[PDB]
Amino acid sequence: KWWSAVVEERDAQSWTISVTTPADAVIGHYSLLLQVSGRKQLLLGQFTLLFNPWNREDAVFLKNEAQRMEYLLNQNGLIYLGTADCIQAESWDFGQFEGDVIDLSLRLLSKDKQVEKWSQPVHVARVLGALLHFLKEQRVLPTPQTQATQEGALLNKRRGSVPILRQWLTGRGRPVYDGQAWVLAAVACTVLRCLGIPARVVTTFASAQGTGGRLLIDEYYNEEGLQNGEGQRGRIWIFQTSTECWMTRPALPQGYDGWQILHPSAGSCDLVPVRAVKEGTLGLTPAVSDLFAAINASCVVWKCCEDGTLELTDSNTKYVGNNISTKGVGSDRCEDITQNYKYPEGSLQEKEVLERVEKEKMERSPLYLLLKAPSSLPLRGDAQISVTLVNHSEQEKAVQLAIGVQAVHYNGVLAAKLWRKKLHLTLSANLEKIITIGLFFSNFERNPPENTFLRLTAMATHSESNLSCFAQEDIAICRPHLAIKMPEKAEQYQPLTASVSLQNSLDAPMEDCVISILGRGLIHRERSYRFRSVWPENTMCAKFQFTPTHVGLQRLTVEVDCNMFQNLTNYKSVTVVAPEL
Amino acid sequence: QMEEPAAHDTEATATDYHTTSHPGTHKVYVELQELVMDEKNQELRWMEAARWVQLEENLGENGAWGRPHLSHLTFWSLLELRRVFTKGTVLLDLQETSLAGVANQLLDRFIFEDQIRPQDREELLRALLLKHSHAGELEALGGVKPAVLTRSGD
Amino acid sequence: LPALHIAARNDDTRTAAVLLQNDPNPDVLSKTGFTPLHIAAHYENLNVAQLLLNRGASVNFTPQNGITPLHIASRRGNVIMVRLLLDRGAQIETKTKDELTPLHCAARNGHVRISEILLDHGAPIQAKTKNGLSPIHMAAQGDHLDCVRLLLQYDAEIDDITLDHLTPLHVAAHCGHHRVAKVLLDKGAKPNSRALNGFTPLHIACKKNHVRVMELLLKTGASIDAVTESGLTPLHVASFMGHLPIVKNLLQRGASPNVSNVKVETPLHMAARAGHTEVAKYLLQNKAKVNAKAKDDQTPLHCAARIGHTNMVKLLLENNANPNLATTAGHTPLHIAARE
């Protein structure tokens, strides 16, 4: 069990010595020294020591093997973005198994000065999370306020994690702007996957990032149906990425081993087991209450007016923190672990836990509407939406209806004002009425930014009664599909021709077609090719030739840029086998 | 027809390959080989000609290495090296373990940069995969003569 | 031999190697009766698993339970063990004591990759356990979305029933999963499908108080009006269970309190049978005729008198239901109040 070494096989000029290791030892660069009774101590070499999910007796131990290869041995991951109604993955390459990454991580570790508490993964994980949160707050520059579409192809293209790590440590590459600040979790996951701690990257849709400790959220809205002013201390973000690591908690009471969420705080970090988040034990860790409140809290919406007096409005309840998903194992598809995070809504158990957390915190319409809107809207296209109105009053009534459309960032930051429309209606005889209206991009006021999502709001003010009805929906913009034609299995050291096809669904002719292909173990670094103009009716189909080199399971990615849009990516996997002897 | 496009180079992502790894210092030993053909059968193969441990040491036709001596080069050589190195092709930090992968990536970069025609890739790839002899086998060969490859392969 | 299974648990290769060098027994039973191969498939220790499979390890070696090692391997989810046991030979179509196939437990646990491998290896998609439950029903129970997506992509007959006629939408609404309801909706379903009792999925949503399923079903266009084989309505189910926000939404979205069952009963008569107060106030606020007759022409005071609960009476007398009114038998609210 303890440090041991046996000399098993003996030759007249050689010994074969088998060194053994303890289950709980500090990781880092070691050095071996041999000291006979006579001579000075002799240096024999250097090595490094990491964690192993294969040993039964170690603390950080995973039983399943395929989970190890997915969460620790894999390099080609996916990150899911978009709304929960249509989710689009983007292929990513952590590249944790480069040469210098381990030494970089150890150089980051060495600013702690508490050496022996490096033997345990809890302290290392907490310190690395804190330092990485400080480093992201240090080296992240805000976005350029001026509009630069010709360089928008370069501001928001990402190649991986190691360049971001290099530019964060040294600042000798392209910076990472506030438009994509969600990479941090992935970076940390990369670091743990480098170090030996199993980890994965989850995405929570419709999260309430902001202030915490309170289970109520205020929102301010214009008379016309927009948001007066910008920003708020606590707002509901569209999505939020987080990092999960698998280990066992001996310091906690018994019964909480497994997955933990890594949560930095504005610096001390901490990690929380998922069963602790579901059960709701606030006093177990100072951070559980805010993160669990961040998941199931309710919002109220206020109506601003010309006088400055704020008014409560009757709206449909919207959900927060739904459809958390991650990359499935052994495939290229998404899986939802939301049953591990919440009880089914409307159970006895969830009502019980709500009553318990509320008990712990206590110590501390004559007409309405509803909206049907599509889940996805094509670029340079159009769609239809419908709003119904049902009144409950024997008398007729006049109403003023306003509709607003505006772009918003992924962190609740307002982006651009797009469209507004105001009209008058008269409901009668307690009969429902449906209004269907189209939405064309030509009728808008501005071109949308690179990465935004449209928010459509509807406000119905009764002329007689000041109590008004309100509804909101969010829609993401979808891009045309990119067809990849390729055989499933390939032989090593053989030519292979892949095809890529694109149809110009847009109403405008494309110019400056610039595409790029890359992939690990297929092409050394990157390539690029240029093309002619593509008219709105015709398509473009092209073919490339390469040869696989590293046997196993790979995937390649292509990325296209043009004048209408930039950084349109797609990917495709392949299994290559050894050649026949 | 499916139109073959043109390449384009733009090195915004060049910064995205610069490791910070200080490699360390190491001595070098240079060995030169070129295409020849033995007399008993008309088969081309690579044969070494000299080594550069400290000085240029050449290998004779009899198979014995001579004396070390100073290194003198020729002027036409330096001209052609400057011309071909000014417009040459570089491949840095290759991640390989066998020569065939290096050859394949070299061919892909040649085709990508319009260095060679696609119809010549097979013959040169056949050339670069022949057996590489050493100093012990020369007396077994019975003599060799320099040969040049051809499109037909003869 | 009670320690050979411990050697399997710890993957002790040399000890088991000696144990099979001396002894010729490749399979012995514990007190439960499980072989060392069962725990080797459990803890994924494959060196001793290969050593056992080299000699005599019958892949179809069933105890009285009938649980194959393939069943446990599909239960805990070990992929490489499934591939190894299928390479060495495996009978896919077997039954347990409960006639469970490995696909049943695979769909129940949620391991989608093992199910893809199994359907690749010729496992029959259509099957029937002791009850007759399809694997999609169990996969819809355990809230496994993408596994359901995979069975839909490969092959699935959506509107399937079992001994109690249950579409997977029905068990989805009984287990409270709106995501599988969405996918099963957009792929294909029928809201009109009824069980043996005659219940709509709206009835199940009114019973188990799931809200997102009710909103999605009504956004689909499931009819407000519906007739149970007993004669009730989904508003009647929501009133009988005492869920206020479901009543609020369904009565907001268009409903009629004036409705008659096979015994003429409003949701007020059937609600004051239990005395849920807030739903009664909410239905009374909108247009409902409190002066009403039941099957035996009992006023809501008659059904409210048997409870003995006070303020339901004061709310009913707020809309001045008269105590002068009496039933066909002559009984009055005073008569029933003195009876109870």
PDB file of N, CA and C in Angstrom, chain A residues 397-453:
ATOM      1  N   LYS A 397     -65.953  46.256 -24.780  1.00  0.00           N
ATOM      2  CA  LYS A 397     -64.786  46.915 -24.213  1.00  0.00           C
ATOM      3  C   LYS A 397     -63.812  47.324 -25.307  1.00  0.00           C
ATOM      4  N   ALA A 398     -63.165  48.468 -25.107  1.00  0.00           N
ATOM      5  CA  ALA A 398     -62.091  48.933 -25.971  1.00  0.00           C
ATOM      6  C   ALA A 398     -60.741  48.594 -25.352  1.00  0.00           C
ATOM      7  N   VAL A 399     -59.773  48.253 -26.201  1.00  0.00           N
ATOM      8  CA  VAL A 399     -58.454  47.829 -25.756  1.00  0.00           C
ATOM      9  C   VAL A 399     -57.424  48.372 -26.736  1.00  0.00           C
ATOM     10  N   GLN A 400     -56.236  48.680 -26.226  1.00  0.00           N
ATOM     11  CA  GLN A 400     -55.117  49.093 -27.062  1.00  0.00           C
ATOM     12  C   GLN A 400     -54.023  48.039 -26.971  1.00  0.00           C
ATOM     13  N   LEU A 401     -53.623  47.503 -28.118  1.00  0.00           N
ATOM     14  CA  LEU A 401     -52.653  46.423 -28.193  1.00  0.00           C
ATOM     15  C   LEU A 401     -51.362  46.938 -28.809  1.00  0.00           C
ATOM     16  N   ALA A 402     -50.244  46.636 -28.159  1.00  0.00           N
ATOM     17  CA  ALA A 402     -48.925  47.013 -28.632  1.00  0.00           C
ATOM     18  C   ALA A 402     -48.060  45.768 -28.751  1.00  0.00           C
ATOM     19  N   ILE A 403     -47.192  45.770 -29.756  1.00  0.00           N
ATOM     20  CA  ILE A 403     -46.327  44.643 -30.066  1.00  0.00           C
ATOM     21  C   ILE A 403     -44.923  45.182 -30.289  1.00  0.00           C
ATOM     22  N   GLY A 404     -43.951  44.573 -29.633  1.00  0.00           N
ATOM     23  CA  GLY A 404     -42.567  45.004 -29.744  1.00  0.00           C
ATOM     24  C   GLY A 404     -41.639  43.842 -30.019  1.00  0.00           C
ATOM     25  N   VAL A 405     -40.654  44.085 -30.876  1.00  0.00           N
ATOM     26  CA  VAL A 405     -39.648  43.096 -31.238  1.00  0.00           C
ATOM     27  C   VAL A 405     -38.288  43.748 -31.056  1.00  0.00           C
ATOM     28  N   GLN A 406     -37.396  43.075 -30.329  1.00  0.00           N
ATOM     29  CA  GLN A 406     -36.067  43.642 -30.125  1.00  0.00           C
ATOM     30  C   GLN A 406     -35.061  42.533 -29.853  1.00  0.00           C
ATOM     31  N   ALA A 407     -33.823  42.753 -30.286  1.00  0.00           N
ATOM     32  CA  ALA A 407     -32.767  41.773 -30.071  1.00  0.00           C
ATOM     33  C   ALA A 407     -32.134  41.911 -28.691  1.00  0.00           C
ATOM     34  N   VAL A 408     -31.694  40.775 -28.153  1.00  0.00           N
ATOM     35  CA  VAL A 408     -31.133  40.689 -26.810  1.00  0.00           C
ATOM     36  C   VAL A 408     -29.953  39.726 -26.842  1.00  0.00           C
ATOM     37  N   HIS A 409     -28.919  40.045 -26.062  1.00  0.00           N
ATOM     38  CA  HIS A 409     -27.760  39.182 -25.904  1.00  0.00           C
ATOM     39  C   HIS A 409     -28.130  37.925 -25.118  1.00  0.00           C
ATOM     40  N   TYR A 410     -27.128  37.072 -24.894  1.00  0.00           N
ATOM     41  CA  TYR A 410     -27.345  35.808 -24.201  1.00  0.00           C
ATOM     42  C   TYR A 410     -27.287  35.946 -22.687  1.00  0.00           C
ATOM     43  N   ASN A 411     -26.923  37.119 -22.183  1.00  0.00           N
ATOM     44  CA  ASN A 411     -26.822  37.378 -20.755  1.00  0.00           C
ATOM     45  C   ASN A 411     -27.789  38.473 -20.322  1.00  0.00           C
ATOM     46  N   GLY A 412     -28.929  38.564 -20.997  1.00  0.00           N
ATOM     47  CA  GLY A 412     -29.942  39.542 -20.673  1.00  0.00           C
ATOM     48  C   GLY A 412     -29.635  40.947 -21.134  1.00  0.00           C
ATOM     49  N   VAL A 413     -28.468  41.173 -21.734  1.00  0.00           N
ATOM     50  CA  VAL A 413     -28.110  42.503 -22.204  1.00  0.00           C
ATOM     51  C   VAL A 413     -28.922  42.832 -23.447  1.00  0.00           C
ATOM     52  N   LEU A 414     -29.569  43.993 -23.436  1.00  0.00           N
ATOM     53  CA  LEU A 414     -30.327  44.433 -24.597  1.00  0.00           C
ATOM     54  C   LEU A 414     -29.375  44.709 -25.751  1.00  0.00           C
ATOM     55  N   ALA A 415     -29.811  44.383 -26.966  1.00  0.00           N
ATOM     56  CA  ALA A 415     -28.951  44.526 -28.133  1.00  0.00           C
ATOM     57  C   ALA A 415     -29.460  45.569 -29.117  1.00  0.00           C
ATOM     58  N   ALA A 416     -30.697  45.455 -29.598  1.00  0.00           N
ATOM     59  CA  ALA A 416     -31.166  46.410 -30.593  1.00  0.00           C
ATOM     60  C   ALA A 416     -32.685  46.461 -30.604  1.00  0.00           C
ATOM     61  N   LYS A 417     -33.210  47.652 -30.888  1.00  0.00           N
ATOM     62  CA  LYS A 417     -34.638  47.859 -31.084  1.00  0.00           C
ATOM     63  C   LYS A 417     -34.966  47.585 -32.545  1.00  0.00           C
ATOM     64  N   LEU A 418     -35.954  46.728 -32.782  1.00  0.00           N
ATOM     65  CA  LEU A 418     -36.235  46.249 -34.129  1.00  0.00           C
ATOM     66  C   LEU A 418     -37.577  46.708 -34.677  1.00  0.00           C
ATOM     67  N   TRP A 419     -38.673  46.476 -33.958  1.00  0.00           N
ATOM     68  CA  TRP A 419     -39.980  46.778 -34.525  1.00  0.00           C
ATOM     69  C   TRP A 419     -40.994  47.044 -33.423  1.00  0.00           C
ATOM     70  N   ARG A 420     -42.005  47.846 -33.750  1.00  0.00           N
ATOM     71  CA  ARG A 420     -43.109  48.098 -32.837  1.00  0.00           C
ATOM     72  C   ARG A 420     -44.362  48.394 -33.648  1.00  0.00           C
ATOM     73  N   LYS A 421     -45.514  48.091 -33.052  1.00  0.00           N
ATOM     74  CA  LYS A 421     -46.794  48.243 -33.736  1.00  0.00           C
ATOM     75  C   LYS A 421     -47.901  48.426 -32.709  1.00  0.00           C
ATOM     76  N   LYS A 422     -48.748  49.435 -32.905  1.00  0.00           N
ATOM     77  CA  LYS A 422     -49.812  49.745 -31.960  1.00  0.00           C
ATOM     78  C   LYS A 422     -51.139  49.842 -32.698  1.00  0.00           C
ATOM     79  N   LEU A 423     -52.177  49.232 -32.127  1.00  0.00           N
ATOM     80  CA  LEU A 423     -53.492  49.228 -32.752  1.00  0.00           C
ATOM     81  C   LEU A 423     -54.573  49.196 -31.679  1.00  0.00           C
ATOM     82  N   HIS A 424     -55.801  49.481 -32.104  1.00  0.00           N
ATOM     83  CA  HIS A 424     -56.962  49.560 -31.229  1.00  0.00           C
ATOM     84  C   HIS A 424     -57.963  48.479 -31.614  1.00  0.00           C
ATOM     85  N   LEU A 425     -58.558  47.834 -30.612  1.00  0.00           N
ATOM     86  CA  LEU A 425     -59.530  46.779 -30.851  1.00  0.00           C
ATOM     87  C   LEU A 425     -60.716  46.953 -29.913  1.00  0.00           C
ATOM     88  N   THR A 426     -61.842  46.360 -30.306  1.00  0.00           N
ATOM     89  CA  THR A 426     -63.082  46.409 -29.536  1.00  0.00           C
ATOM     90  C   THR A 426     -63.632  44.997 -29.393  1.00  0.00           C
ATOM     91  N   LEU A 427     -63.534  44.435 -28.192  1.00  0.00           N
ATOM     92  CA  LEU A 427     -64.067  43.106 -27.939  1.00  0.00           C
ATOM     93  C   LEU A 427     -65.520  43.209 -27.496  1.00  0.00           C
ATOM     94  N   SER A 428     -66.316  42.223 -27.906  1.00  0.00           N
ATOM     95  CA  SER A 428     -67.752  42.267 -27.687  1.00  0.00           C
ATOM     96  C   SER A 428     -68.279  40.885 -27.336  1.00  0.00           C
ATOM     97  N   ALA A 429     -69.349  40.866 -26.542  1.00  0.00           N
ATOM     98  CA  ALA A 429     -70.225  39.707 -26.372  1.00  0.00           C
ATOM     99  C   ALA A 429     -69.496  38.478 -25.839  1.00  0.00           C
ATOM    100  N   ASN A 430     -68.375  38.677 -25.145  1.00  0.00           N
ATOM    101  CA  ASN A 430     -67.650  37.593 -24.479  1.00  0.00           C
ATOM    102  C   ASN A 430     -67.267  36.491 -25.464  1.00  0.00           C
ATOM    103  N   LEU A 431     -66.907  36.884 -26.681  1.00  0.00           N
ATOM    104  CA  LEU A 431     -66.466  35.953 -27.710  1.00  0.00           C
ATOM    105  C   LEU A 431     -64.960  36.060 -27.907  1.00  0.00           C
ATOM    106  N   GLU A 432     -64.307  34.908 -28.028  1.00  0.00           N
ATOM    107  CA  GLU A 432     -62.883  34.880 -28.321  1.00  0.00           C
ATOM    108  C   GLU A 432     -62.612  35.430 -29.715  1.00  0.00           C
ATOM    109  N   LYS A 433     -61.421  35.997 -29.891  1.00  0.00           N
ATOM    110  CA  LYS A 433     -61.023  36.538 -31.183  1.00  0.00           C
ATOM    111  C   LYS A 433     -59.543  36.282 -31.406  1.00  0.00           C
ATOM    112  N   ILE A 434     -59.202  35.735 -32.567  1.00  0.00           N
ATOM    113  CA  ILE A 434     -57.826  35.401 -32.910  1.00  0.00           C
ATOM    114  C   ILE A 434     -57.343  36.378 -33.971  1.00  0.00           C
ATOM    115  N   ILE A 435     -56.119  36.867 -33.805  1.00  0.00           N
ATOM    116  CA  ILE A 435     -55.488  37.781 -34.748  1.00  0.00           C
ATOM    117  C   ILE A 435     -54.190  37.137 -35.206  1.00  0.00           C
ATOM    118  N   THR A 436     -54.084  36.875 -36.504  1.00  0.00           N
ATOM    119  CA  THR A 436     -52.878  36.320 -37.099  1.00  0.00           C
ATOM    120  C   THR A 436     -52.165  37.410 -37.883  1.00  0.00           C
ATOM    121  N   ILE A 437     -50.874  37.581 -37.613  1.00  0.00           N
ATOM    122  CA  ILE A 437     -50.086  38.637 -38.233  1.00  0.00           C
ATOM    123  C   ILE A 437     -48.740  38.070 -38.665  1.00  0.00           C
ATOM    124  N   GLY A 438     -48.287  38.492 -39.847  1.00  0.00           N
ATOM    125  CA  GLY A 438     -46.998  38.074 -40.343  1.00  0.00           C
ATOM    126  C   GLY A 438     -45.856  38.903 -39.790  1.00  0.00           C
ATOM    127  N   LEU A 439     -44.656  38.352 -39.938  1.00  0.00           N
ATOM    128  CA  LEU A 439     -43.418  38.979 -39.491  1.00  0.00           C
ATOM    129  C   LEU A 439     -42.402  38.807 -40.607  1.00  0.00           C
ATOM    130  N   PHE A 440     -42.102  39.902 -41.299  1.00  0.00           N
ATOM    131  CA  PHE A 440     -41.155  39.934 -42.402  1.00  0.00           C
ATOM    132  C   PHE A 440     -39.933  40.743 -41.994  1.00  0.00           C
ATOM    133  N   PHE A 441     -38.754  40.300 -42.433  1.00  0.00           N
ATOM    134  CA  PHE A 441     -37.535  41.024 -42.088  1.00  0.00           C
ATOM    135  C   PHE A 441     -37.450  42.366 -42.797  1.00  0.00           C
ATOM    136  N   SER A 442     -38.090  42.494 -43.958  1.00  0.00           N
ATOM    137  CA  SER A 442     -38.055  43.765 -44.668  1.00  0.00           C
ATOM    138  C   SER A 442     -38.789  44.863 -43.906  1.00  0.00           C
ATOM    139  N   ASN A 443     -39.775  44.507 -43.083  1.00  0.00           N
ATOM    140  CA  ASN A 443     -40.491  45.515 -42.310  1.00  0.00           C
ATOM    141  C   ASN A 443     -39.737  45.993 -41.075  1.00  0.00           C
ATOM    142  N   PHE A 444     -38.624  45.360 -40.719  1.00  0.00           N
ATOM    143  CA  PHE A 444     -37.880  45.764 -39.537  1.00  0.00           C
ATOM    144  C   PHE A 444     -37.133  47.075 -39.771  1.00  0.00           C
ATOM    145  N   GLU A 445     -36.558  47.586 -38.684  1.00  0.00           N
ATOM    146  CA  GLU A 445     -35.840  48.850 -38.687  1.00  0.00           C
ATOM    147  C   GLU A 445     -34.331  48.682 -38.784  1.00  0.00           C
ATOM    148  N   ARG A 446     -33.797  47.516 -38.432  1.00  0.00           N
ATOM    149  CA  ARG A 446     -32.355  47.341 -38.381  1.00  0.00           C
ATOM    150  C   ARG A 446     -31.994  45.909 -38.737  1.00  0.00           C
ATOM    151  N   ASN A 447     -30.733  45.728 -39.106  1.00  0.00           N
ATOM    152  CA  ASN A 447     -30.170  44.400 -39.301  1.00  0.00           C
ATOM    153  C   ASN A 447     -29.713  43.847 -37.956  1.00  0.00           C
ATOM    154  N   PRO A 448     -30.013  42.591 -37.647  1.00  0.00           N
ATOM    155  CA  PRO A 448     -29.647  42.040 -36.339  1.00  0.00           C
ATOM    156  C   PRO A 448     -28.146  41.857 -36.211  1.00  0.00           C
ATOM    157  N   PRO A 449     -27.627  41.846 -34.982  1.00  0.00           N
ATOM    158  CA  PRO A 449     -26.187  41.630 -34.781  1.00  0.00           C
ATOM    159  C   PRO A 449     -25.779  40.185 -35.019  1.00  0.00           C
ATOM    160  N   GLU A 450     -24.524  39.851 -34.706  1.00  0.00           N
ATOM    161  CA  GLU A 450     -24.005  38.534 -35.060  1.00  0.00           C
ATOM    162  C   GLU A 450     -24.646  37.435 -34.222  1.00  0.00           C
ATOM    163  N   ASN A 451     -24.643  37.588 -32.900  1.00  0.00           N
ATOM    164  CA  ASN A 451     -25.217  36.580 -32.011  1.00  0.00           C
ATOM    165  C   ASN A 451     -26.218  37.268 -31.092  1.00  0.00           C
ATOM    166  N   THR A 452     -27.495  37.183 -31.455  1.00  0.00           N
ATOM    167  CA  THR A 452     -28.577  37.797 -30.703  1.00  0.00           C
ATOM    168  C   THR A 452     -29.800  36.899 -30.787  1.00  0.00           C
ATOM    169  N   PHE A 453     -30.803  37.210 -29.973  1.00  0.00           N
ATOM    170  CA  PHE A 453     -32.067  36.493 -30.045  1.00  0.00           C
ATOM    171  C   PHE A 453     -33.197  37.498 -29.921  1.00  0.00           C
TER     172      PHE A 453
END
